[PDB]
Amino acid sequence: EAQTETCTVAPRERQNCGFPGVTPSQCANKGCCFDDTVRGVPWCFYPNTIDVPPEEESEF
């Protein structure tokens, strides 16, 4: 068994990890998923590990 890292969460269902004026380094200081693609929403937010009973295959 194992877990998977996932930061892609619903923009509204996102947990604010800090203000937006922050920077890639600040958000990477604690370890929050930083995402600056859309506006209006927060870029620095926390991660959300989802349980995936079935393991998938990826490139190795």
Curated annotation (Swiss-Prot):
Consequence of changing V22I: In a gastric adenoma sample; somatic mutation
Keyword Signal: yes
Coiled coil: none
Keyword set, alphabetical order: Disulfide bond, Growth factor, Secreted, Signal
Cysteine disulfide links: C7-C33, C17-C32, C27-C44
Compartments (UniProt record): Secreted
Predominant subcellular localization, coarse grouping: secreted
Tissue spec. comment: Found in stomach, with highest levels in the upper gastric mucosal cells (at protein level). Detected in goblet cells of the small and large intestine and rectum, small submucosal glands in the esophagus, mucous acini of the sublingual gland, submucosal glands of the trachea, and epithelial cells lining the exocrine pancreatic ducts but not in the remainder of the pancreas (at protein level).
MF term (GO), any: growth factor activity
GO cellular component, one term: extracellular space
GO biological process, one term: response to immobilization stress
Domain P-type: start-end pairs: 5-48
Function: Stabilizer of the mucous gel overlying the gastrointestinal mucosa that provides a physical barrier against various noxious agents. May inhibit the growth of calcium oxalate crystals in urine.
Subunit structure: Heterodimer with GKN2; disulfide linked.
Name of the featured protein: Trefoil factor 1
Residues of the full protein shown: 25 to 84 of 84
